[PDB]
Amino acid sequence: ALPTWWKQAVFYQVYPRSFKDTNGDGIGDLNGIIENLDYLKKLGIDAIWINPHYDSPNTDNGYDIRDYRKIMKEYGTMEDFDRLISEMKKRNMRLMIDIVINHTSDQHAWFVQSKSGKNNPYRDYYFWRDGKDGHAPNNYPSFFGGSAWEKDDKSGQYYLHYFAKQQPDLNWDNPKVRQDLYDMLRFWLDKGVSGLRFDTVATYSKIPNFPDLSQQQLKNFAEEYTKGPKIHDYVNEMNREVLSHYDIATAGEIFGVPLDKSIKFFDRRRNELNIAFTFDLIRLDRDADERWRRKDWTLSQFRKIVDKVDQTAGEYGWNAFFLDNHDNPRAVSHFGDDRPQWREHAAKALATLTLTQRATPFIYQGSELGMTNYPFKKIDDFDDVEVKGFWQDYVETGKVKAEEFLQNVRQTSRDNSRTPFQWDASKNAGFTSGTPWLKINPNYKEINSADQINNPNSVFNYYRKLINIRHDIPALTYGSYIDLDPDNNSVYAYTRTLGAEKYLVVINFKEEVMHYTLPGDLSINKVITENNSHTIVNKNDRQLRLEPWQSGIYKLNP
Numbered sequence: 001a002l003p004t005w006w007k008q009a010v011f012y013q014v015y016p017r018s019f020k021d022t023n024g025d026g027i028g029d030l031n032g033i034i035e036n037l038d039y040l041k042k043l044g045i046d047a048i049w050i051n052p053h054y055d056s057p058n059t060d061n062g063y064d065i066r067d068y069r070k071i072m073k074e075y076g077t078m079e080d081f082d083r084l085i086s087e088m089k090k091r092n093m094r095l096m097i098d099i100v101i102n103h104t105s106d107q108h109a110w111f112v113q114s115k116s117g118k119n120n121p122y123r124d125y126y127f128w129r130d131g132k133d134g135h136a137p138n139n140y141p142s143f144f145g146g147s148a149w150e151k152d153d154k155s156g157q158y159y160l161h162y163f164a165k166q167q168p169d170l171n172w173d174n175p176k177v178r179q180d181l182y183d184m185l186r187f188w189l190d191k192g193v194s195g196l197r198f199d200t201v202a203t204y205s206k207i208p209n210f211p212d213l214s215q216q217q218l219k220n221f222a223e224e225y226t227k228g229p230k231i232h233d234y235v236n237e238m239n240r241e242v243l244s245h246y247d248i249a250t251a252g253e254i255f256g257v258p259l260d261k262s263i264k265f266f267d268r269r270r271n272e273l274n275i276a277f278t279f280d281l282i283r284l285d286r287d288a289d290e291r292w293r294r295k296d297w298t299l300s301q302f303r304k305i306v307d308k309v310d311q312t313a314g315e316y317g318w319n320a321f322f323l324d325n326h327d328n329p330r331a332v333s334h335f336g337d338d339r340p341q342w343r344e345h346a347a348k349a350l351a352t353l354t355l356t357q358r359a360t361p362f363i364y365q366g367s368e369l370g371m372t373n374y375p376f377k378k379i380d381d382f383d384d385v386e387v388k389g390f391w392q393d394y395v396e397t398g399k400v401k402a403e404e405f406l407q408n409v410r411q412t413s414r415d416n417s418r419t420p421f422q423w424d425a426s427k428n429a430g431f432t433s434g435t436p437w438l439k440i441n442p443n444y445k446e447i448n449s450a451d452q453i454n455n456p457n458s459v460f461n462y463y464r465k466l467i468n469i470r471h472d473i474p475a476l477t478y479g480s481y482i483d484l485d486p487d488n489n490s491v492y493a494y495t496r497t498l499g500a501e502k503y504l505v506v507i508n509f510k511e512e513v514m515h516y517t518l519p520g521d522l523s524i525n526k527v528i529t530e531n532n533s534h535t536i537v538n539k540n541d542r543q544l545r546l547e548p549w550q551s552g553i554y555k556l557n558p
């Protein structure tokens with residue numbers, strides 16, 4: 001305890017741009033979310049987090065916000081948004097929206113004023129600094145390419161942007177900025193939204209006097225930008241003045257925070273946020289310097305991080321658990337085996353893992369079908385401003401050969417999870433009557449929601465089954481987690497425990513039969529579910545014969 005709705009909820013993340021287009025322009029919209037709420041209710045989802053839905057020039061597909069109180073033109077109108085809320089309410093579903101207050105679009109009113117001159121009332125809503133020797137104020141690099149400082153000719157000063165040039169960072173040291181942002185949150189909260197997901201929540205506080213980063217720091221600079229001295233003062237003040245006045249669940253995207261600093265954002269006793277979005281597991285295999293490059297990882301590596309993330313939240317914090325999202329490759333491709341012989345078994349294995357963590361699971365759109373990475377071939381096949389940034393920094397500088405770069409970003413690109421959702425087997429997978437904004441995977445003929453929703457053997461129906469299982473067995477939400485062997489590279493096996501109620505999850509990550517004898521005096525009381533099982537499990541069994549990619553949940557004898 002204490003149980004809460006958000007600790008036991010299963011969330012589903014909708015990327016509105018890519019979910020369902022209802023007017024043939026090739027871009028998903030709010031009406032397309034509305035028309036598929038029944039599909040999500042059938043899956044068993046009780047809360048939806050949507051990516052940014054606000055007025056935006058779309059340099060970063062919604063995360064460059066030009067007006068926080070207007071609906072993005074491509075997604076519809078305020079009336080569409082209000083209908084989404086009402087139709088969700090009719091179905092007892094809760095909405096989480098994406099709060100993007102580290103930065104605005106450079107087209108936002110505040111910035112247009114800010115940049116007009118030093119005497120403008122909005123000058124100090126952003127960070128403006130003089131050059132150093134006709135170079136940037138310091139050596140800060142941007143996540144999205146080049147310098148974090150952009151020269152403005154009007155003023156002769158540079159403005160700070162951790163993300164795109166078009167995403168100038170807001171000055172949280174200015175109390176008037178925080179007050180405006182709080183009034184903006186009340187505008188949304190007053191409409192009955194149930195959740196807020198805080199985008200890059202850890203970078204709001206900037207480092208006094210902006211010193212250069214050391215050579216070493218430049219190889220891992222995300223962590224330097226989360227070291228701002230006032231980050232927890234600001235998050236707690238936002239809690240005291242806004243968040244604690246409403247009845248909501250809040251998540252924090254803590255990019256660049258070392259795991260051992262994460263707890264301060266989520267410890268309930270700190271009155272900061274509720275739910276941790278950590279990067280440790282999802283990017284375990286990502287180079288910290290060349291953040292587009294991946295490397296081999298093993299199951300022991302993966303499970304050791306699961307354990308550490310679980311231990312860190314400990315008694316007083318709480319985790320989100322997810323294996324993909326709009327910023328990462330698809331789970332079945334990245335963590336599973338997406339080849340035809342294994343895709344469905346691995347997707348179901350990963351679903352099992354996700355829906356048996358001591359955490360609020362987040363299912364990203366299309367993962368419930370076992371959607372895969374997309375076979376990108378050339379740089380032009382990508383849309384993402386971030387990959388273009390990496391291309392300019394690493395390839396156009398001649399530092400990395402184009403083909404080696406592609407081999408990596410094919411595996412790591414955020415655009416892997418942005419290809420349109422595969423509704424059915426018709427033209428463009430039923431996503432759009434027009435031309436989709438980003439090409440649809442040709443595997444849509446094999447992988448689509450219409451082919452799955454009524455097949456009781458489908459990935460979709462296995463997610464549905466797991467969600468009902470998790471709802472039925474409190475130990476699968478609140479139970480303590482023990483990894484039976486953190487150094488095993490083949491069979492992932494852990495227990496979830498509440499008093500005498502003890503459940504065992506076993507997943508065979510190998511594409512060969514694996515025999516696995518339980519440790520100590522553990523033995524099986526019941527099979528709760530299995531996928532790809534061939535050898536029956538009887539009362540008191542002490543061993544399981546695991547087919548390749550087999551997964552299962554078992555009640556253990558007390």
Ligand SMILES: [Ca+2]
Nearest residue numbers: 021023027029
């Ligand atoms: Ca549309």
